[PDB]
Design a protein around this ligand. Structure first.
Ligand SMILES: Nc1ncnc2c1ncn2[C@@H]1O[C@H](COP(=O)(O)OP(=O)(O)OP(=O)(O)O)[C@@H](O)[C@H]1O
Ligand SMILES: Nc1ncnc2c1ncn2[C@@H]1O[C@H](COP(=O)(O)OP(=O)(O)OP(=O)(O)O)[C@@H](O)[C@H]1O
Ligand SMILES: Nc1ncnc2c1ncn2[C@@H]1O[C@H](COP(=O)(O)OP(=O)(O)O)[C@@H](O)[C@H]1O
Ligand SMILES: [Mg+2]
Ligand SMILES: [Mg+2]
Ligand SMILES: [Mg+2]
Lengths: 507, 90, 475, 99, 282, 295
């Protein structure tokens, strides 16, 4: 009718007509962008800019489109052309990510090559329901005495590592990662093997490099992949990276493989979300955080599940991490996450400054699953240990008056102090389950009460070497039967007697 | 939401082909007044921090230059100033 | 009538109709979509435009998709066929046992019963818990609140009330899960299938027969958008209103946590174009709650007893949500973290807790007098906390020391080991009748138990257990 | 009242005063019909890729190539100067709603 | 064309009505012919006189240490579950003996109970407690409950003041109780925020003071030329954590002729009513 | 490019271009007044308009004033010639000793080191101080807090760290003054010239010969607006990144005060109209501190 006029004057009008698959940027700022066009764009759709930068189609206004940029606001200009990838935000999954550090979007950074591709599972999928789910009935060997004994972590659980800064959270995570080496190499069957994922959010890049180096030293990257969204990276990537890690773990969960995901720290992700929200002019709330923070963390954590016998039988643990400020857990984000998890692992600065490391408190640390996430051999010992530590915590108020107090109180204090000195461990030095059982059997049978507290360290080490030389049969019998019968118990008592005989200590 | 140029006294000029934009960059017309603030249309050429003078001898400081108006703070009371007054640069 | 999606903002969708608009609260179905996305109308905006809240995720929607008006609000089925069956907010069962073959469906939205159609007859419940039976007696046919932060024992208390009431009820019951963990939902389903509250039977041809069940289930959990959390309690209330209206039978309704319902509005009103109130909450924080609570009420037809767990963010009871919720309750139970750190469970603060069924015209004068004496004692102990922390017990007189002893003893005595805690406590459960509680409190107040220790009252139930434990502790 | 109301009232006044009414009425009607039939003039109005100079040039070419009065041309130049070109159709309805 | 108005008269006595005079007792309509505007100008300085007659509350601490007059505006401020509604209901119940032993309307004291934000179960319990003692033939109730929309909660106290102005100008004494006023402030905040008006402190408007001043200045003791009537007011306020440094309590304290503070510490120590006779004044 | 100023709101200048807008963080030079004015882009708005934060005062600006786009962000000079000198955020010297005759220029906005180009082996820093090396050992690539005001001997500790790291490790040093008192800067400059950290030797013609020194200075004065005080640490950080990368030697960076940098960011965010965070601070606090500290 009149298109010849526009074609003549504008000199290229016919090409800017199809605004259904191509669009034009209009405004940029604060990580947000406005596009004109893209009428056929899906919500949550991935969008590709001119200079390779990407984004998420967040808001679909009547004419404009509000987009979140997975990067810095310098590779995006007003006037740039914008395309449709035609698919929701997705990330690669499967074998191929193992031993590979990647960004939030599956792009590698360790400099080793590209990554293979499945059908690229989505990121913000919905969680499972109630029927396919199953109760937790098997453990996750962490390698820490106090955790595996008193705060048992199950397989299909969501237990929280909460504590102030510089207290040994990342240490707990990396020990949990390292302890799986002997269990994985010895099986060759993916139903029993436990892979892992470590998601860093807002963490310093040097720490991530050191962690990767320490894992490569101990050969603990054949079965791990790392997802890095550090402090220099934009806020959308920190907001994503947890969801990308959970999408990578959903492959193991659905397949029937067992995987554990560690989040460092979730609070950083909450801060990034707060940033993105305030930059979208949204109304703040408590501590300036919006109301969609609970939904964020709960979307993230409800995916951790123990699938049933009919849904493959897989599992997905989750060890989220939170940094408090002066130990205040009555704050908003800690309480939001405590209402989501199935447990709690507390860490104190007093115990960490004194020397007690790992600084895992035990009166505040809890676990809803409990004994169901333990083997019988460790149940039989950890019950007595927990009871004795409760007694010690009760009667420690009057420890200075031990001379004035009865022999019962002094015996309780001695046993509690011995156990407390026994729960200590070095960094990057986990322990097998059978060794833990043997050590705690030595402890809860008064063999350490007369012994001096400081000696209990080297004692333990020596004892371990003894049972790794002659009594390997006891260890294999415990690992197979998963139980301390009277015969193995008598063998262990005989070995302990021979050990205390052959070796000298302060008492 | 309307601009000072969009009021229904000037568009009667623009629509009528009137091109009487010979009004210099020195002269402007007050558009709004309140609480010791004034908002002008014109003075395209006034500097930030510059003094301006109204019809009734009072003077003010131009602070918030904008694409459509100019924000002025008054060295006196607003009873003297009223919409439609003229403003000139010093 | 067909309509078009013009705008999408998270959990909000603005739709455009050409010929005729739908009223508010009406349901709309999106056609070009994988699942059954339902939209609840909330506003009208002119230009034949409508604003809606989505009951599911909006990922995948397009500006141009087609929408169909159902002509009525959301419809949930009702009857004895919903019993022993899980149902989401839109009535769709997620139990994987077949469809719901119910004849009648009620609307999610109903006007509350009138003033004349009320009957405030005072009764009591047998919870088996010492603290509530003594100092905050629960009212048969009234609303009950459990206020607490995170990690103080609301869910355990609700499960204990289920085991001690619903199984010994005879009538019907309902459980609504509003933003709680799916894990505990599956746990409750299996515990109910165990205790016989839900009697599932698999026929030869794959069908099921829930005949004999006495409990329905409605679950809208954390893995849901806000629109699917702000409309679940209404579903449960329709399911219970059917029973106490046509059936005319008493019903028990349990809600975990109600606060989530308000929270959804908080993360919606910003998108609906509303100005925020004090703490980012909505301006509609009171009416959206009163319209939900006023539907819960005993009437001349039947009765709904309700037990609502109310979250308290950051342990702040001055927050608008619990502050508003306090006005709608007939009985209260405020849990505390300071008391849980002492190992006392249930961590009930007996001073912040209160009730309307404590007067002597309902309970006897011995019950009333014992409760008030206990409250006086605990307040007198609270009044000395500062001077004990700074100076010490030695500064106190002898009357104050006797008061402190009896107050610590009665604090520790108001601590009960439940049956459901056996999994992480080991000690067996202790049901406790009311007269035993009253006798024990009378004896502790008189001074007939000053000879005993303080740690002999911890998790013992009655007094015979306390004396036996003191005997065993003498060794 | 509204923006389109302001422009329509100004045009109604100046058309009733000096030039004509039927001319501008037919011009606005033809423009609205072109907007509702061409399906590209609408996008030319809404699109931001079109420079202000290209907009004014196309508008003046439409002026020359059709029966057109200068009042409507000044209206279009004003709507372009104030970023109100998408409000053409609405304004046209006001000029049709005064009949 | 009608400004929002409500009926007035003795037809309201013994009846329970909503904010607009529509009955909800379920027994018959409201037989009243004369109406009255809701929002009105309070009486001026000249048609007034000093307060000299007492309003027998029935309690001992109030009638002795914190006395109340006819034409007074005394606040009942406290925390939740402390005995405020009980104080007001005892004030209502004490009047049946005084009213039965006379037929002079100049000495009788009629009563009005305005329930804002309450639930219908509580209002029904109060009505039952009053009927059990024959204390409804001289009272009326104005129930703007929680399910009822915000405008009704905002208008109910003004409707009650309008119903009491009939007694005030006719030479018959009346006492009006507002339970709780704060709920009314919350309703006003809701309406103003949904009308896109801008907020102020604690998201409230600035017009909350005007709201409560408009309402409480209508209580007065008129002169012998204007009949000699009265309208006593006994508003109720629920504080949080005993914080009377808040925004609504501060206003209503600064625009009342007294205070009856109520504390939980005294309530559990054994003192019931829990009136702190130090802070409470008149 | 050439553009025009459309509006001036204090230290927030909105500018209009006809074509080929400049990217964000680019520099714009105003033409038509003294006191060379540099504008840093921060936000696109549409209509070929951009918003900018000014590094200096906006008094005397006019709408329609012409503006040039340099085509790259604020480019600071780098080299051994910046030793002993003082420089502002825009690289200009304020020591009244001549221009910086450097053969290179680096942007102040540089991407941090990647995950591959980063050392996994930590190592201490041999200072030469007993209490430090004993009870609070420093580290390479580390960030050390220094809690102490005046009256304690902080400046002498600073000069000692510089001298000892230059002698033993052979590495230079940098000092950034993020909104410092001006007399304190003069005092520090004179103390450096006295202690031999700086060697300002006069020449015959009248120029200066800054021979082998041990520290460059980058002063962001308190009288400077927000936008300058926020972009000073990045200048010194680029000056140090020069020595790190090509020179390949350890360097020491001193920032006095980190909090002031945070204050400048909060102010800049408030001017542009961004809704503040918890305690009035900006919503880009941790992100900006990471953009800084990750380098
Ligand atoms: N069992 C341990 N024995 C000795 N040192 C330990 C032990 N566990 C942790 N640490 C030490 O604590 C310090 C902090 O370690 P870690 O990074 O794991 O804590 P963090 O809570 O993650 O701190 P951040 O807040 O920086 O993340 C390290 O130096 C580490 O060597
Ligand atoms: N003189 C009194 N003696 C004993 N108990 C009293 C007395 N006065 C009130 N109470 C009791 O206080 C409790 C609360 O009653 P009331 O209706 O007055 O609550 P309130 O102060 O109005 O607070 P709210 O209505 O918000 O719950 C009741 O249990 C009541 O029996
Ligand atoms: N009677 C109790 N006995 C022992 N532990 C309890 C008891 N009640 C609660 N707990 C502990 O506190 C935690 C509370 O979690 P939960 O039952 O979900 O309450 P909430 O809903 O308030 O978070 C539990 O993990 C449990 O270990
Ligand atoms: Mg860490
Ligand atoms: Mg719970
Ligand atoms: Mg009350």
């Amino acid at each position: 009718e009149m298109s010849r006029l526009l074609e003549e004057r504008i000199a290229g009008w016919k090409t800017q007509t199809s605004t259904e698959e191509v669009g034009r940027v209009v405004s940029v700022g604060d990580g947000i962008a406005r596009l004109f066009g893209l009428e056929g764009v899906q919500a949550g759709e991935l969008v590709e800019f001119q200079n390779g930068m990407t984004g998420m189609a967040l808001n679909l206004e009547t004419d404009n489109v509000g987009v979140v940029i997975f990067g810095d606001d310098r590779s995006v200009l007003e006037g740039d052309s914008v395309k449709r990838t035609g698919r929701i935000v997705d990330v690669p999954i499967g074998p191929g990510l193992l031993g590979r550090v990647v960004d939030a979007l599956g792009n590698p950074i360790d400099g080793k090559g590209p990554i293979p591709a499945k059908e690229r599972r989505r990121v913000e999928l919905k969680a499972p329901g109630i029927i396919p789910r199953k109760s937790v009935h098997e453990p996750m060997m962490t390698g820490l005495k106090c955790v595996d004994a008193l705060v048992p972590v199950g397989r299909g659980q969501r237990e929280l590592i909460i504590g102030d800064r510089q207290t040994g959270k990342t240490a707990v995570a990396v020990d949990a990662i390292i302890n799986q080496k002997e269990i994985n190499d010895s099986t060759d069957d993916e139903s029993k093997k436990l892979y892992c994922i470590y998601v860093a959010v807002g963490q310093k890049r040097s720490t991530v490099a050191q962690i990767v180096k320490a894992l490569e030293q101990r050969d603990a990257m054949k079965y791990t992949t790392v997802v890095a969204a550090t402090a220099s990276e934009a806020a959308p990537l920190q907001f994503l990276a947890p969801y990308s890690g959970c999408a990578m773990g959903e492959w193991f969960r659905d397949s029937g493989r067992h995987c554990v995901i560690i989040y460092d720290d979730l609070s950083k992700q909450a801060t990034a979300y707060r940033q993105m929200s305030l930059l979208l002019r949204r109304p703040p709330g408590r501590e300036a955080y919006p109301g969609d923070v609970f939904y964020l963390h709960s979307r993230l954590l409800e995916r951790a599940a123990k699938m049933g016998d009919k849904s493959g039988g897989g599992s997905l643990t989750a060890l989220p991490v939170i940094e408090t400020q002066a130990g205040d857990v009555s704050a908003y984000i800690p309480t939001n996450v405590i209402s989501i998890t199935d447990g709690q692992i507390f860490l104190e600065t007093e115990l960490f400054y004194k020397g007690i490391r790992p600084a895992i408190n035990v009166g505040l640390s809890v676990s809803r699953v409990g004994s169901a996430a333990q083997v019988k051999a460790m149940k039989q010992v950890a019950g007595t240990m927990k009871l004795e530590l409760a007694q010690y915590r009760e009667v420690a108020a009057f420890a200075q008056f031990g001379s004035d107090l009865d022999a019962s109180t002094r015996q309780l204090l001695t046993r509690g102090t011995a156990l407390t000195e026994l729960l200590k461990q070095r960094q990057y030095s986990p322990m097998k389950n059978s060794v833990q059982v043997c050590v705690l059997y030595c402890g809860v049978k008064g063999y350490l009460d007369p012994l001096d507290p400081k000696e209990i360290s080297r004692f333990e080490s020596l004892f371990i070497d003894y049972i790794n030389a002659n009594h390997q049969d006891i260890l294999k019998t415990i690992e197979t039967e998963k139980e301390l019968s009277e015969k193995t118990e008598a063998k262990l008592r005989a070995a302990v007697d021979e050990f205390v005989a052959m070796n000298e200590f302060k008492k | 939401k309307i601009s000072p140029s969009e009021m229904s006294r000037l568009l009667e000029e623009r629509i009528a082909g009137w091109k009487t934009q010979t009004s210099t960059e020195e002269v402007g017309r007050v558009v709004s007044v309140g609480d010791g603030i004034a908002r002008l249309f014109g003075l395209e050429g006034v500097q930030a921090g510059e003094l301006v003078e109204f019809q009734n001898g009072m003077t003010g400081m131009a602070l918030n230059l904008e694409t459509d108006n100019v924000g002025v703070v008054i060295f006196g009371d607003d009873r003297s100033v009223l919409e439609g007054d003229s403003v000139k640069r010093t | 009538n067909h309509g078009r999606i013009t705008q999408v903002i998270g959990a909000v969708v603005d739709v455009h109709f050409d010929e005729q608009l739908p009223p508010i609260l009406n349901s709309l179905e999106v056609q070009g979509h994988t699942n059954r996305l339902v939209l609840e109308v909330a506003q009208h905006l002119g230009e034949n435009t409508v604003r809606t809240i989505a009951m599911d995720a909006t990922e995948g929607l397009v500006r141009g998709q087609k929408v169909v008006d159902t002509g009525a609000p959301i419809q949930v089925p009702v009857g004895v066929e919903t019993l022993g069956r899980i149902m989401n907010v839109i009535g769709e069962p997620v139990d994987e046992c077949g469809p719901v073959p119910a004849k009648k469906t009620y609307s999610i939205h109903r006007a509350a019963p009138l003033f004349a159609d009320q009957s405030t007859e005072p009764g009591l419940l047998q919870t088996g818990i010492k603290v509530v039976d003594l100092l905050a007696p629960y009212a048969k046919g009234g609303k009950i609140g459990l206020f607490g932060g995170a990690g103080v024992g609301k869910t355990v208390l609700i499960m204990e009330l289920i085991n001690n009431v619903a199984n010994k009820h005879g009538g019907f019951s309902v459980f609504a899960g509003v933003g709680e963990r799916t894990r505990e939902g599956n746990d409750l389903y299996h515990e109910m299938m165990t205790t016989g509250v839900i009697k599932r039977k698999k026929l030869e041809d794959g069908k099921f027969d829930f005949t004999g069940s006495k409990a329905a289930l409605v679950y809208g959990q954390m893995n849901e958008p806000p629109g699917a959390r702000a409309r679940v309690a209404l579903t449960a209330l329709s399911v219970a209103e059917y029973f106490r209206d046509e059936q005319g039978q008493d019903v028990l309704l349990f809600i975990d946590n109600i606060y989530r319902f308000t929270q959804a509005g908080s993360e919606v009103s910003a998108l609906l174009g509303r100005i925020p109130s004090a703490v980012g909450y909505q301006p509609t924080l009171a009416t959206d709650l009163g319209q939900l609570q006023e539907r819960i009420t005993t009437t001349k037809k039947g009765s709904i007893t309700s037990v609502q767990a109310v979250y308290v963010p950051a342990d702040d009871l001055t927050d608008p949500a619990p502050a508003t919720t306090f006005a709608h309750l007939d009985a209260t139970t405020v849990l505390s973290r300071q008391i849980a750190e002492l190992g006392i469970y249930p961590a009930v603060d007996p001073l912040d807790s209160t009730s309307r069924m404590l007067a002597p015209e309902i309970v006897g004068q011995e019950h009333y007098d014992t409760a008030r004496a206990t409250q006086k004692l605990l307040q007198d102990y609270k009044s000395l906390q500062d001077i004990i922390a700074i100076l010490g017990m030695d500064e106190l007189s002898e009357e104050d020391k006797l008061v402190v002893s009896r107050a610590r003893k009665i604090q520790r005595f108001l601590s009960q080991p439940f049956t459901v805690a056996e999994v992480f406590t080991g000690k067996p459960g202790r049901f406790v009748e009311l007269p035993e509680t009253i006798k024990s409190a009378q004896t502790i107040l008189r001074g007939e138990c000053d000879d005993l220790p303080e740690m002999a009252f911890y998790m013992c139930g009655g007094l015979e257990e306390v004396r036996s434990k003191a005997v065993k502790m003498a060794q | 009242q509204t923006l389109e109301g302001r422009y329509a009232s100004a045009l109604f006044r100046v058309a009733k005063k000096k030039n004509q009414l039927e001319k501008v009425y037919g011009d606005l009607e033809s423009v609205r019909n072109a907007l509702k039939d061409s399906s590209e003039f609408r996008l030319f109005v809404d699109s931001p890729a079109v420079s202000v100079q290209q907009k004014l040039d196309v508008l003046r070419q439409l002026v020359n190539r059709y029966k057109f009065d200068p009042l409507t041309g000044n209206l279009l130049t004003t709507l372009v100067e104030n970023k109100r070109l998408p409000m053409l159709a609405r304004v046209a309805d006001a000029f049709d709603a005064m009949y």
